[PDB]
Each structure stands twice: as structure tokens, then as C-alpha cells.
Amino acid sequence: EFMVKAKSWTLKKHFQGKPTQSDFELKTVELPPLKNGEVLLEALFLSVDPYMRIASKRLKEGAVMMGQQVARVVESKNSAFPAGSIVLAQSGWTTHFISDGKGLEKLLTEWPDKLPLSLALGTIGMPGLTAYFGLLEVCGVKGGETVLVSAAAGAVGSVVGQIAKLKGCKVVGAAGSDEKIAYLKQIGFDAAFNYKTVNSLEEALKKASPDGYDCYFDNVGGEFLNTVLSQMKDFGKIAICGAISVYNRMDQLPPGPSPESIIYKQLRIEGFIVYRWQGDVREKALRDLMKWVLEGKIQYHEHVTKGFENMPAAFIEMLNGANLGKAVVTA
Amino acid sequence: SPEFMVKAKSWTLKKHFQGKPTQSDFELKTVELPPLKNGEVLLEALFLSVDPYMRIASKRLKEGAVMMGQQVARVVESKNSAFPAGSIVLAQSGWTTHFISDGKGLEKLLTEWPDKLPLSLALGTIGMPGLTAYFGLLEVCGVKGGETVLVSAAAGAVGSVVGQIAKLKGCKVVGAAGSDEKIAYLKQIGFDAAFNYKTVNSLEEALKKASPDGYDCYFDNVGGEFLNTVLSQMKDFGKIAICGAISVYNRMDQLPPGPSPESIIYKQLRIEGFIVYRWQGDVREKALRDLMKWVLEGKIQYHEHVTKGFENMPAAFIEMLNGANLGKAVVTA
Ligand SMILES: NC(=O)c1ccc[n+]([C@@H]2O[C@H](COP(=O)([O-])OP(=O)(O)OC[C@H]3O[C@@H](n4cnc5c(N)ncnc54)[C@H](OP(=O)(O)O)[C@@H]3O)[C@@H](O)[C@H]2O)c1
Ligand SMILES: NC(=O)c1ccc[n+]([C@@H]2O[C@H](COP(=O)([O-])OP(=O)(O)OC[C@H]3O[C@@H](n4cnc5c(N)ncnc54)[C@H](OP(=O)(O)O)[C@@H]3O)[C@@H](O)[C@H]2O)c1
Numbered sequence A: 001e002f003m004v005k006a007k008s009w010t011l012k013k014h015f016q017g018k019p020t021q022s023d024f025e026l027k028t029v030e031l032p033p034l035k036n037g038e039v040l041l042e043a044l045f046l047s048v049d050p051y052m053r054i055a056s057k058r059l060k061e062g063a064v065m066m067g068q069q070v071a072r073v074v075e076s077k078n079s080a081f082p083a084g085s086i087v088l089a090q091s092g093w094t095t096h097f098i099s100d101g102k103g104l105e106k107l108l109t110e111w112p113d114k115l116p117l118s119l120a121l122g123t124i125g126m127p128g129l130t131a132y133f134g135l136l137e138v139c140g141v142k143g144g145e146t147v148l149v150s151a152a153a154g155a156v157g158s159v160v161g162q163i164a165k166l167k168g169c170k171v172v173g174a175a176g177s178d179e180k181i182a183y184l185k186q187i188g189f190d191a192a193f194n195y196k197t198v199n200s201l202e203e204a205l206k207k208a209s210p211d212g213y214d215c216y217f218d219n220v221g222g223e224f225l226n227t228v229l230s231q232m233k234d235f236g237k238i239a240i241c242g243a244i245s246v247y248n249r250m251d252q253l254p255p256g257p258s259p260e261s262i263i264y265k266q267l268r269i270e271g272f273i274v275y276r277w278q279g280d281v282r283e284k285a286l287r288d289l290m291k292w293v294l295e296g297k298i299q300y301h302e303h304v305t306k307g308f309e310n311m312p313a314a315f316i317e318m319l320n321g322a323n324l325g326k327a328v329v330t331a
Numbered sequence B: 001s002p003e004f005m006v007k008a009k010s011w012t013l014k015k016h017f018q019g020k021p022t023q024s025d026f027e028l029k030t031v032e033l034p035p036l037k038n039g040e041v042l043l044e045a046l047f048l049s050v051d052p053y054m055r056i057a058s059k060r061l062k063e064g065a066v067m068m069g070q071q072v073a074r075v076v077e078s079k080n081s082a083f084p085a086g087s088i089v090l091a092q093s094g095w096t097t098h099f100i101s102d103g104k105g106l107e108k109l110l111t112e113w114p115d116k117l118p119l120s121l122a123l124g125t126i127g128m129p130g131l132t133a134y135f136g137l138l139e140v141c142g143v144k145g146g147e148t149v150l151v152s153a154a155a156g157a158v159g160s161v162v163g164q165i166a167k168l169k170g171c172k173v174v175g176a177a178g179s180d181e182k183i184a185y186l187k188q189i190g191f192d193a194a195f196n197y198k199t200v201n202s203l204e205e206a207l208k209k210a211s212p213d214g215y216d217c218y219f220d221n222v223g224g225e226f227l228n229t230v231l232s233q234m235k236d237f238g239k240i241a242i243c244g245a246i247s248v249y250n251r252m253d254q255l256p257p258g259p260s261p262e263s264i265i266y267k268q269l270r271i272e273g274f275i276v277y278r279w280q281g282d283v284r285e286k287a288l289r290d291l292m293k294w295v296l297e298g299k300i301q302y303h304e305h306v307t308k309g310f311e312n313m314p315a316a317f318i319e320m321l322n323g324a325n326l327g328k329a330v331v332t333a
């Protein structure tokens, strides 16, 4: 018997504005031996996500940061999760974790070795499912429509654009760098603009689509959303997925949208949470995402930070827009 | 047969509104009308509407133009076979006492109109605002029975109809209005709860007090900060019908902070704007017949806030925006 030392990232201090390296503190803990019905997990790939900026509020200062990871079962006294098997675990930022099967999800069966397991945290996982349902259910695209997506080169945004493309939609993206814009055009976005460098957001959205937009997949909220409303087609739909423009500054209230746009254009605005879709419909969506990736219809890119010690940085840099595609940390 | 000249009075927009409208923004003009040509009719205003939309629509006017709006008018004289002298029409002829029409923009009054119902109802409960309430509640909110419904400006033209249709459809209704008199009126016509949003110590407390289980639909007539407060009270997958936003009409370019993304996402709320004119033809006509039936059955009680005299019309409009009116604001010429 050898002692397993689990390293964990803790919330040393609550976030003020943008998170900093010193808001985090590593702890090391010797784990106990497994009881029957339990497994020992070792992190392979750990996700960092925007929601961690929000969820960190409810944490008691000193607790382990929340999050999902892909982990290998090292030791098992649980027959549902044999040693060597791979699981999705809501175990937070930790190198090793003991579970009784509680928050454990088996990866899609028939998972191809050609596909990196870290895709289970992105395109073929929660962000991909958010994109799938937000676009296909909330916006309800069926072909011919013009779709705008913000944070277009991120984990959710990249999938939205490419699914909208395969559905026969015209797709416009807004992202935060020229490199991101170059990438977006090369994966099928019909138009893409850098939102930081616009002369006028109004004219940028006008140039991208002079006839306006059928669907806005909103990842950023704030004043971007407000400007978008003025350019929605009548009876247009806005899927409120996130509001990242207002996560680092939840204290500073964003100015009101135009009642004129919402009323005159008779717009529909709908917030959604990915977890709303369960059972058969969720499994089918995961199979769809898997198939579209295997068919090269959803290209993927992962923004990989190598090393568990670098996990705080990966999260900070992702919030600031360093990532093209899903931000993932390898142990 | 000797003919006498007709003098038409009109209220013009002297100056575009800046913040709250005032009397000085309006200028009365008197025009001697030409004789009727063949195909034309002379109309005399009976009842003229004042409405919130006029605060926004005014921005498109050229200064010196007649203020826009709908009226119930009588055909005084007619050289148009389609419009008999003595018949009653609705016309979007604006704030004017008399006008000449070639028939183009004239809506014949709803047939089978009973004497016992004041014609001015055609501009409120059995008219545009009643249709707004009808479709806003039944089609946008989509009530089926059992829902808890919140309505702002509850004692106004639209709001009073909303609450009463909701009660006859089997819903629980909560109203917010700006005076104690209005609150007592709301309770009297069947609202389950009603509160004065101006005088309550906390707006959030009053909403939780009125409905602990929260709200299935909010029929929003006011928007602004009031709407922001309501979202925290909404039920999961609740609906907000964006009918109007009167609390911001005076400050469209200086808006207050907007809705909470947390509330909209976390509760998965559905917000929809709508325009009453979306519903036309048979669906619109049936809605009107339904409204009249429910009025005649006593399921929809009405009150009108009547201003006597055309020269009092700008004041009627100003005070309606300021909340003087219980029920539909209307000017009797
Ligand atoms: N409703 C749901 O169930 C659900 C689920 C998952 C995610 N979400 C939401 O979806 C959004 C994207 O999530 P993700 O996981 O795909 O992350 P992501 O897009 O891969 O990463 C976040 C990106 O947002 C952009 N960003 C950061 N600050 C911004 C700001 N000030 N204004 C505009 N853009 C900014 C950055 O890219 P740029 O270079 O383009 O600025 C950054 O790369 C988030 O808002 C998240 O909360 C919602
Ligand atoms: N979408 C459409 O097709 C359509 C059609 C018709 C009407 N509307 C809208 O529906 C709303 C009501 O119309 P209406 O014709 O029935 O007018 P109304 O309610 O009869 O009269 C306006 C009322 O708004 C209230 N109000 C004024 N300022 C306010 C403020 N700052 N905060 C909260 N309430 C305020 C006042 O009542 P209180 O005493 O309660 O404050 C006032 O009596 C308006 O917003 C209008 O634009 C929309």
C-alpha cells in the first residue's frame, strides 16, 4: 500500500474584478484507502469554464474550486467503474479524488481512440450540448436563417457556428482577436469581426449582415446584446446563454436595452441552461456531436495548458480571451 | 341651399417632447375647411383617444404637424356612397375636431353595437387597448387556467382588461398601480391582490407578499426598474409579455440599468415583445366580439377617464402619462 497525495487548488481569496494568481492556493492531502463501492480517480484533463467566475461566489473561502474533469480509474471497489476505465467527474480542481460513484458519468460508449478524451469536456460534452440545444431548440433554426454568435471562437461559439453551417444557415461571428477571426472564416463562418477593434459595433453588424439577423446566440450580454437588438429581423429570437462581458464586473449594472426594438420588432428573448435537456434527447445530442466531429463537420481546437500547477493561469487567461476553442488543462 | 363654412380645430406638435410633455409643446390651430368634393365625407369628432404610444410616435412628426391618434367620428355630410351621413366611423385622423376624408382610412364601427355601451368604448375596452390585453394575455402569456399573472399599470386601459380576462379564464391576478384609489378599484373588479408601487416600502416585498409561489406570466406595461425587480419573482420558465415600457418613455436616450442575466438564465425566462396589430382579419374580429360579449355579460367591467372639451386634449394626454386616469383616457368633443 502506497499513500496517494491529492493536490488541489483552493479559493484562497474571493475574486475582485479579474481573478489573479494569488486568489488561489494549492493544498496537498494524503487520501485514505478505498472502502467497498468506491473508486480512486486520477485527473487526466481538467476543464476551466466561465461559470467558475460566478460559482466561486458561493464558495467558502479556502474550499476547492468546482469543475468537471476527465479521469482514469486507478483503483476500484466499484463494479460499474472498473480499474483503467475513463469517467467524467464533477470533482473540482484536484489531481486525485475518491468517489462512491456519486457524481460520475461514463463517457459515450464506442468512443473512438482517434478522438482526444478531452473532447468530453468540450465539443462532445457540456459546451457542445449548450451550443446544440441553444441553437436547435431555443433559436430553432431550420435553414436559410442568418445566425449571429458572440464569443464565436470559444468552446460554445465554435460549435454553434459549425452546426448552424451544416443546417444551411448564414453564420456571423464576433470574437476578440484577428487570429480568432481568421480561424472562424476557415471553419465556415461567412462573416466574422473583431469586436474590440470595431469603428462602430452598429456598422460592424451592419457590414456583416445588412439584412439583419434571425437568431442571436448570446454568450456575452451587456452592450453588445443591446446593439444587436436594433439589428434583429422582426420576430427574431435571442438565445441568452451567457453574459461574460458582465462576469468580472457583476457589481456594475449594464444599461437597459431598447423597448422600441423588443416591442416594434416583436423579439423573443429566452435564457436557457444546458441541463434542461435530459435522458434520450441528451444522449442523441451527444451522438450527433460525436458523428459531426467524426465527419469533419465540426472541426475542433483545444487550447491546452500543460500541467496541473498551471490551472489557475489557464482559467485566468480563458476569461481574458487567450483561448481559441475549449480551454483544457492536462495533469 | 346655402352652405356654411366648417372650422376645424387641430392640436399640432409645436415642439418635440423633451422629458415629460408640457402644454407649451402643443399649439392649437383653426382651419377653414374646403367644400366636400365628390367621393368625400365630412367627419366630426365625437370621442378622441390619448395613448402612451403618442409619446414615442411624436418623435417622427415634423414640428407643426397635427398630433396622431384615433377617434370615433360621425359623418356629418357625405358625397361617398360607401359612408352614409349619420354613420359612425373610427379614423386615425389625429387630434382634430373635423376632417375631410375620401374614405381611405375609415373603419366602420363594429356592427350590432348596443346603445347601452358608450361609443368611446370602441377606443378602449372594445377597441385597440382591449385587443392588446386580449392577445397579450391569451396568445403571448398563453394562459390556460390556474396561472398567477402579474400586471403593471393594472388600472389603466390595457391593464384593467388584462386582469379581468385573466380572472374569467381561471387565473390568479396581481395588479400594480400608482394610487390607493386605483388599488381599491382593482380589488372591487376581481383582482386577487393589488398594491401601490409608489408607496410600498419595498417593491420586492410587495410582490412576494402578493404571491409566495411566484408568477407564471408578467404582463409588462411599464418596463424600466420595475421590470428588473419582477424577474427575481418570476417562476422557472415564466413568461414576460413586453407590451409597453411607459416608465422609460421620457428618457429613451437615458435608460436605467437593464435586466439581470442571472435571473433570465438561472430561471430560464421567456421575454417577448408584441404589437397588437399582429392579429388581423377573422382572429381580430372574433376578439372584438368576445370583448363585447364579456362586457355585456358583466365579466369585463369598464371605467372611462373622460375629459370634456377638445381644448383640454393636451392636458388629458399629459395627465394620462402622469397617471391621473382610472381606465381609458378619452376626450369628448
Ligand atoms: N446556459 C448554459 O447552460 C451555459 C453553459 C456553458 C456556457 N455558457 C456560457 O457561454 C459562454 C461561453 O462559454 P465557453 O465555455 O464556451 O467559454 P469560451 O467561449 O471558450 O471562453 C470565454 C470567452 O469569452 C470571451 N470574453 C471574455 N470576456 C469578454 C468580454 N468582456 N466581452 C466579450 N467577450 C468576452 C473570450 O473570447 P474573446 O476573445 O472573443 O473575447 C473568451 O475566450 C459563457 O458566457 C458561459 O457562461 C452557458
Ligand atoms: N404593444 C402594443 O400593441 C400596445 C398597444 C397599446 C398599449 N400599449 C402599452 O401598454 C401600456 C398601457 O397602455 P394604456 O393605453 O392602457 O395606457 P394606461 O395604462 O391607461 O395609461 C398609462 C398609465 O401608465 C402608468 N404609468 C405612467 N408612468 C409610469 C411609471 N413611470 N411607472 C409605472 N407606471 C406608470 C399610469 O398609471 P399608474 O397610476 O399605475 O402609475 C398611467 O395611468 C403602455 O405602456 C402602452 O405603451 C402597447
Ligand SMILES: COc1ccc2c(c1)c(CC(=O)O)c(C)n2C(=O)c1ccc(Cl)cc1
Pocket (backbone or CB within 6 Å): A050, A051, A052, A054, A055, A056, A241, A242, A243, A272, A273, A275, B261, B262, B263, B265, B266
Ligand atoms: C447547479 O446548476 C447550474 C446551472 C446553471 C448555472 C450554474 C449552475 C452556474 C454556476 C453557479 O452555480 O453559480 C452558472 C454560472 N450557471 C449558469 O448557467 C449562468 C450563467 C450566466 C449567468 Cl449570468 C447566470 C447563470
